[PDB]
Design a protein around this motif. Structure first.
Motif, PDB file in Angstrom:
ATOM      1  N   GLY A 211      11.093  35.315  39.281  1.00 39.25           N
ATOM      2  CA  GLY A 211      11.984  34.442  40.036  1.00 39.25           C
ATOM      3  C   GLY A 211      11.268  33.398  40.892  1.00 39.25           C
ATOM      4  N   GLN A 212      10.016  33.095  40.537  1.00 38.57           N
ATOM      5  CA  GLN A 212       9.202  32.117  41.239  1.00 38.57           C
ATOM      6  C   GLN A 212       8.515  31.228  40.223  1.00 38.57           C
ATOM      7  OE1 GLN A 212       9.777  33.565  45.324  1.00 38.57           O
ATOM      8  NE2 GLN A 212       7.966  32.238  45.006  1.00 38.57           N
ATOM      9  N   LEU A 213       8.496  29.936  40.513  1.00 40.43           N
ATOM     10  CA  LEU A 213       7.693  29.019  39.762  1.00 40.43           C
ATOM     11  C   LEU A 213       6.499  28.627  40.633  1.00 40.43           C
ATOM     12  CD1 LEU A 213       8.296  25.467  38.790  1.00 40.43           C
ATOM     13  CD2 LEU A 213       6.870  27.081  37.608  1.00 40.43           C
ATOM     14  N   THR A 214       5.308  28.739  40.038  1.00 42.97           N
ATOM     15  CA  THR A 214       4.097  28.317  40.732  1.00 42.97           C
ATOM     16  C   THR A 214       3.571  27.065  40.093  1.00 42.97           C
ATOM     17  OG1 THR A 214       3.631  30.588  41.426  1.00 42.97           O
ATOM     18  CG2 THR A 214       1.850  28.914  41.694  1.00 42.97           C
ATOM     19  N   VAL A 215       3.399  26.026  40.911  1.00 46.45           N
ATOM     20  CA  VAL A 215       2.880  24.746  40.433  1.00 46.45           C
ATOM     21  C   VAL A 215       1.590  24.438  41.197  1.00 46.45           C
ATOM     22  CG1 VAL A 215       3.390  22.343  39.918  1.00 46.45           C
ATOM     23  CG2 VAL A 215       5.242  23.857  40.212  1.00 46.45           C
TER      24      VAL A 215
END
Lengths: 102, 102
Positions: A39-43
């Motif tokens: 449930g997390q997007l890491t950019v």
């Protein structure tokens, strides 16, 4: 001179899809990385510092953002595109909605 | 949702020239205007607001900056270029300097 970089982020509801728009002007495209852990997007990515600065307002160097999905998305559906200093990352929603036009 | 836009600006000393770098990701290129009135550069333009926002950090709409030259420049020498969400405006200095390499 040349501050720490936190690129500004939008989440757009695109009905069947969820879009992340990330303002990344001047980025070295080859340093951009995108990873979804539930449930997390890491950019992450980088832009070079500007040489011989007389005045500086613009951020430089590496950036890292950890961004929670506003809406649950299908696993492994993320597709990223970069144009005009903007990163558009598109995900398909678990529960798609459809705009009712009038 | 969608804040007032003040694009971040750098002045780079490029020896014979003075460069203004302006972070303008997602700008409608056709709205960009640049005017030099003696010792001030005026930059204006616009980017559309993002539709159907769920979360917003990114600025939208028209921007206007009035920016003083850190160094005097020759009149009517300004040349502007846009790539990767960055506007580079180059002016030739009245008193050019030259980097001494070692």
């Amino acid at each position: 001179q040349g501050g720490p970089w936190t690129p500004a982020a939008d989440w757009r509801d695109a009905g069947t899809h969820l879009d992340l728009l990330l303002d990344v002007p001047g980025v070295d495209a080859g340093t951009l990385a995108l990873a979804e852990d539930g449930g997390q997007l890491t950019v992450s990515g980088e832009r070079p510092g500007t040489e011989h600065l007389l005045r500086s307002e613009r951020p430089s160097g590496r950036f890292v953002r950890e961004l929670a999905f506003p809406e649950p998305v299908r696993p492994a559906s993320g597709v990223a595109s970069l144009a005009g200093g903007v990163l558009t990352v598109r995900f398909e929603k678990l529960r798609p909605t459809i705009d009712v036009t009038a």
